[PDB]
């Protein structure tokens, strides 16, 4: 019944899905045809932001309108962290979700957007449970547990998914009297910590993101307990985006079926080569 | 209507009062005759705990019963931080408040008592706003803003009262969007930070404690915005406890009346000499 | 007082965009787009950053050409502490001098004694203490400055939030604690108290540094600024004239998201800029 | 077998074990309702205050204690001093406590407790340490705070640490348990056994700074199976009454009315020392 | 107004203010020619030696001093203790000294002295500090050395610092004064007022370690308006004669013949302590 619970409920519709970053209407249609649950409109895929640098901002509203017209699935778009006016603009365009995104250039180093001031649901990133709960308290309706952006290396996503889920599991069995100190140590609101304890999972939808390059990577994130995955660079920096996109969607749908995982992985073209930051 | 709001309401009755630490029934009757709003039963006054050392614990229930029978004003008693069984015992004795007190020897370095598990209201100490709000979330119905224990030096009480009240004032005018980060930096629950912002004061009664040795000290705490004062050592380590006790009560009642402050301060005996730690 | 007159004049610029211009063509584009004033300088901050070299006051000839090409107020930059550059600018007959940190510092320890001039000055700041020091020296207007020449709004946001945040702290502060606050700001007590009583900066406060889009400009206005400077963001973009207009409209209509969409829609390439992380 | 020793120690659940230095202290302990006595040279508060090398008690004094009571008799051996333990076993006592309050004899190795027929108690401060002591053959664990101070703070810390890690382990992803065992420096099989049981695989008592009935009941409410009391009884004003009060507190640990009654009008507690 | 308080304190120029702890000390001071007495609990040398928390004197003792003399009576309040100051003002004394020899009550904030009708004296060690105290409403400044040692070294240092910075300021390029005010962390308007006057905008006395007539005259030759003496009189062998000698030394500070006469055959000076 509360407006926040409605936004949280909306994002539950994406469970079991793949959200694909797209930079134009052609990428958007490929994503919808492959079975994406939503598209994410942005200026440049994370691998290009990494390689090229420059200030990365909200996409031109014209490009976002073109994407929204080209598909019938939900359209999300990115705003810079703390850039509440970029978010106002995106909401006024009539898209379905805003991603307050760390792959864009940070606009406010100390404060995120007050997401409760918006009617549209927000996705925010996190690396740990404290951070997820802070984003939710600010009004995020969905959490992206984020690894490395633009490298094709799943290592940090695995680390962060295990960190968030691990802390949730610790919390479930914890002595109630110790939860106050746990909330302090997370620097997270106590009420949301207790809600997480009672649910035994994050109070909002949790997707993995960062370095998902292969069907195996996507299925791994699902087997670690995520509700879905974002793919940015891994599709559109690969040799065959459309076939790879489809393979990743199938991998997320059939994540516990190794026979299916073999079939969809077999004879894909070149994966994004990416970069090992060690 | 909620059980917590009832406890918070109970403690409001003490506003404008002086709570006096007492170690036996004689000290208790002197305190009531001088006009104390309540007595605090403890093993040894903070100046003696400082001077003598040893492990300081909850007082023998027999001594607490003797004090409770000797007076008609509310009786409080101290329990060690985290010692929830000491608190169970105190509650079963039928006293009016428990002070989860830092002058006693810490029993749990990482966790305070879960005060919501008790029917009886609790007082807890603090040195800053974050700490006050953490104690309130655990279920404290009253806050003691604490300076130095057992020295007769008001400096740290002033510092901590100014810190708590100063942060409350900052909070009142703060951009709402910045309050999330402020709560993180306080390591305090956001809902209580917002409640403090809306009230423009602490959500529970706030008394000063630590080093109140003279009528001037007591009135100073009231002029800095406290709801009342604790006096431990300053009365019963002085030359004339009964007259000094009365003078301090009057100083708190008439804190903005310098003529009255002169009268009550005039010809008191020797104050506690105390110790300058600098 | 003569200072209060200068402070009063700057109040006309409230709700405006001041645009850095390097020649008379840029000046006319700025006026046509609805700029409240132009700022004559040798090179836009992004070019100073990229090229280096010593950056000084512009040639008086170029300033005269800009002043003749427009009817809106003309400002120009002088190096910090370079009081002779400022004497020259005043003698040219421009409307404001910006004692500017984007030019090469001429005096590391002292700013211009701005009370010795008839013309009003703009100075930069990063925090409230600095703003109040510049005002005491005679600045009639303050530019709260982020990063120069990068197109990244992050430091402007940081500094606007710092100045406005300290002003808000000051409003409710116990009067007895203001003496120590003034000491900690290293700011004159009388100006701290004036700021406390007004609940805002005692002069006009604009944002500057990294304003690249209409969204950026409206953000600065929603954070409480009186207007914005734009240097590089217009003239290092793909379509300076259309972008200039969009930024002006964004400042005028800063609380209207429907309007912000319209002016942002189909603008050409923004300045790419540089992320200093 | 080991499971037999572990089963024996389960009988002490709900009890108080009292340190005694002579046969008089032993009889006071049995009369007060102690589940067992612990024969040692000097109570921990005296070892702390006086220093010197603290060793196994003279066998003669241990024999005198064993004859004076019918409840189980335990006695202390220095860590790693397997010959002291051989001697104790040959005396015919019921348990050996390989004890950190005595002067360490081997800084790198504990007694190989599997070589003995008699069950052993060992101390710990964390779960890794408990599991290492169990693998060496400890049939019972004493989760130990500060010895000889009357300050319960470190016992609370260590009980919360052991029990907290057990609770983390219960819900842990199975695939992460290998790394958890590495980080505890504990044997994987015992870590998995702990995970499956949801508790320590042997009896776990609290010890260190238990001075009052409230302290004893606190340890029980935190999930311990019983408590050791060393100094808190025999460095107090009335050892016999305090001993009884502590036994009752452990038996009735969730009954605040009873805790008031037994705490009311006890004499002077051990004054002890605040180290922090 | 502030200018009225500043004008009042100008009357003390050329004088010696003597710390007194009772009415006997007060009468000795008035008889010796003190321009005012300073009522306090204990002389600084006793505060140093004995420690303890040093507070405002009992109002009764202050009333006794105020009745025993006709010269102005000052008394000490702890730094930041604005209620002690309220009390002193309500007693009807002439000046409050917000004094660093008493135990600091507020480490971050001094008394807002503009809220009082009575003039205040405050201490300083440098020009920035003096100007901050004046802006808070001090009507008089005490340039302070070491308290309770009888060693004039720090008073000389601080007098030279304040007066030296004033002399630098007089000739300074006006354009550089803004930065100078920043570096002093002092209000610009008061810095400019000091520059235009060529001296401190309020009366400036020396204090700290004045033990002999020579010390007192030295402070006057360095440009002070007068001196405080605390310990140097009442920790000496003959307080009354020494008190008189110091008054004469301040009155006749440039007359070496007079300085010889008043210094000749005084008893034992306070022995004091060399801290360095
Ligand atoms: Cl960044
Ligand atoms: Cl040892
Ligand atoms: Cl001090």
């Amino acid at each position: 019944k509360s407006p926040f619970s409605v936004k949280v409920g909306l994002a539950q519709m994406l469970r079991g899905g793949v959200i694909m970053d797209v930079v134009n209407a052609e990428q958007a249609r490929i994503a919808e045809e492959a079975g994406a649950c939503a598209v994410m409109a942005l200026e440049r895929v994370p691998a290009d932001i990494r390689a090229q640098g420059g200030v990365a901002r909200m996409s031109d509203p014209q490009m976002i309108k073109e994407i929204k017209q080209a598909v019938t699935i939900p359209v999300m778009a990115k705003a810079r962290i703390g850039h509440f006016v970029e978010a106002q603009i995106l909401e006024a365009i009539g898209i379905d979700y805003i991603d307050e995104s760390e792959v864009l250039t940070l606009a406010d180093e100390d404060h995120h957007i007050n997401k409760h001031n918006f009617r549209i649901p927000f996705v925010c990133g996190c690396r740990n449970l404290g951070e997820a709960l802070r984003r939710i308290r600010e009004g995020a309706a969905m959490i992206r547990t984020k690894g490395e952006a633009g490298t094709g290396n799943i290592i940090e996503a695995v680390r962060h998914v295990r960190s968030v889920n691990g802390d949730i599991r610790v919390l479930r069995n914890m002595d109630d009297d110790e939860v106050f100190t746990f909330a302090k140590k997370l620097a997270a609101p106590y009420d949301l910590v207790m809600q997480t304890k009672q649910l035994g999972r994050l109070p909002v939808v949790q997707f993995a993101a960062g370095g998902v390059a292969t069907p195996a990577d996507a299925a791994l994130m699902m087997q670690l307990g995520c509700d879905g995955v974002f793919v940015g660079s891994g599709i559109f920096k690969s040799g065959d985006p459309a076939r790879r996109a489809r393979a990743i969607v199938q991998a997320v749908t059939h994540y516990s079926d190794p026979e299916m995982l073999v079939e969809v992985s077999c004879g894909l073209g070149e994966a994004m080569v990416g970069i090992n930051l060690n």
Side-chain angles (χ1 to χ4, degrees), chain A residues 126-177:
Chain A
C126 82
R127 297 184 286 100
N128 58 61
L129 179 60
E131 183 171 13
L133 297 182
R134 286 194 298 279
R135 298 295 85 77
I136 292 161
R137 193 64 194 78
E138 295 161 357
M142 180 169 168
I143 291 298
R144 174 168 40 69
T145 298
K146 182 66 168 188
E148 288 176 9
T151 66
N153 187 351
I154 203 71
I155 189 170
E156 293 308 311
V158 170
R159 188 198 310 286
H160 297 152
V161 171
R162 284 196 180 283
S163 172
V164 173
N165 289 352
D167 277 341
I168 292 166
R169 289 184 207 104
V170 164
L171 184 56
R172 299 213 305 260
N173 255 1
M174 181 174 288
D175 175 355
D176 281 337
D177 300 352

Side-chain angles (χ1 to χ4, degrees), chain A residues 30-43:
Chain A
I30 288 162
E32 185 171 36
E33 288 162 9
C37 71
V39 296
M40 175 64 70
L42 83 181
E43 58 159 64

Side-chain angles (χ1 to χ4, degrees), chain A residues 82-140:
Chain A
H83 207 317
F84 52 83
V85 178
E86 282 185 341
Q88 287 162 17
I89 289 168
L90 291 174
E91 183 179 58
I93 292 165
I95 59 166
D96 303 291
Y97 299 78
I98 296 166
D99 186 338
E100 184 180 19
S101 175
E102 69 289 348
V103 310
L104 300 187
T105 304
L106 205 66
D108 191 329
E109 197 167 278
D110 293 328
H111 309 284
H112 284 67
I113 295 160
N114 185 342
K115 292 163 282 281
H116 291 300
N117 289 338
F118 293 79
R119 296 164 348 249
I120 190 165
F122 276 74
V123 185
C124 292
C126 82
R127 297 184 286 100
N128 58 61
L129 179 60
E131 183 171 13
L133 297 182
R134 286 194 298 279
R135 298 295 85 77
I136 292 161
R137 193 64 194 78
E138 295 161 357

